[PDB]
């Protein structure tokens with residue numbers, strides 16, 4: 001169970017594949033987001049599966065229940081390991097998505113909810129009609145996600161321990177915004193996040209921009 | 225006469241979708257590619273539609289951090305789509321960044337539209353996600369945020385259309401789904417008269433034995 005999910009945020013297929021060729025699929029999982037999926041589609045995800053990697057399809061679906069569920073079903077058809085949706089889409093939308101994956105069995109993708117994007121501070125939330133403190137809104141949405149029957153949520157390292165306390169050990173926490181010691185004490189390290197309760201670490205640049213990415217991943221894995 | 229109908233392509237198989245597109249003309253409608261078909265068939269499907277002469281509304285409702293949402297919108301511009309949308313709930317900065325990344329494309333950029341409150345959300349659903357304001361008021365708040373962020377318009381219901389035009393202007397485009405050809409559900413003529421700039425219609429056309437006739441009846445009623 002590799003804990004690191006490497007973020008692939010390239011605007012060029014050649015560079016992305018050149019990078020993946022340097023990595024052992026038993027040492028990490030990969031994340032394909034809106035940029036690469038909009039540019040290269042499901043064939044890129046298939047290219048990653050052909051290479052032996054498990055993928056986290058980070059498309060944060062957010063639409064009416066019928067549509068969101070069909071998008072999640074499409075992710076299951078692609079055979080991805082994990083897929084996410086916005087908790088702001090509501091309990092009904094999330095429940096419908098979890099229901100449509102039941103026939104896929106034990107191999108279905110893990111279905112994760114997005115609470116409050118890290119880019120949203122109080123002023124940003126007030127702009128979209130949310131008056132609650134961001135931390136309280138995160139708990140509200142994470143709880144809604146668990147109640148809808150989802151597998152976990154994406155959360156920051158700072159939010160991890162509190163979520164794990166309120167929602168339980170089995171509810172999975174996927175955490176981006178991690179940096180190896182060195183390279184700010186305010187940003188948690190992989191070890192600090194895992195200790196806090198993060199189940200998976202989403203790491204991009206520290207690995208993708210490294211001269212020797214296989215070495216950086218080995219160092220991260222060894223530190224855990 | 226510029227076509228006002230955008231036909232929703234919500235198929236789970238490519239053969240069926242293309243069999244339909246082969247029987248309608250791009251001078252009579254535009255097409256909408258949503259999360260289902262894009263997740264299943266990707267940008268190559270949009271390219272097939274473009275090769276056939278159709279303009280496409282890429283309905284992926286991007287909602288992410290500003291850097292990512294903007295790179296997704298830029299990707300839509302690279303694909304050459306006519307229109308693309310994002311969630312207004314993503315915030316003013318996310319929306320503004322998405323509009324700013326399109327500047328280098330000049331007039332070839334796609335139209336950028338905001339999604340306000342999904343039709344599936346009534347008061348109970350909104351309260352569940354921490355929104356206590358009346359859905360109608362929340363729609364105006366989000367639509368206003370979208371205009372202030374520099375976007376071209378929003379997706380809205382036929383009922384919301386006239387009020388949005390009154391507050392945001394004739395130049396702020398309104399894309400309206402939930403329309404049915406001819407009493408609570410507005411007809412194409414009723415929605416256009418209210419301010420809708422485009423009408424998103426799926427099943428009445430995609431399930432028809434004679435889609436061209438249905439489109440002509442709709443178009444001739446405007």
Ligand SMILES: O=c1ccn([C@@H]2O[C@H](COP(=O)(O)O)[C@@H](O)[C@H]2O)c(=O)[nH]1
Nearest residue numbers: 007009118176177202203204205206292
């Ligand atoms: O608070 C954060 C931090 C990072 N990321 C995303 O997680 C991945 C890893 O980021 P990085 O390690 O390259 O900064 C990227 O896709 C980045 O956009 C977030 O979604 N939220």
Ligand SMILES: O=c1ccn([C@@H]2O[C@H](COP(=O)(O)O)[C@@H](O)[C@H]2O)c(=O)[nH]1
Nearest residue numbers: 067232234343401402424425426427428
């Ligand atoms: O209130 C609505 C009504 C319809 N649709 C969408 O608009 C398209 C046309 O719907 P229909 O004409 O097939 O009902 C479909 O993609 C449908 O999911 C909405 O998003 N909101």
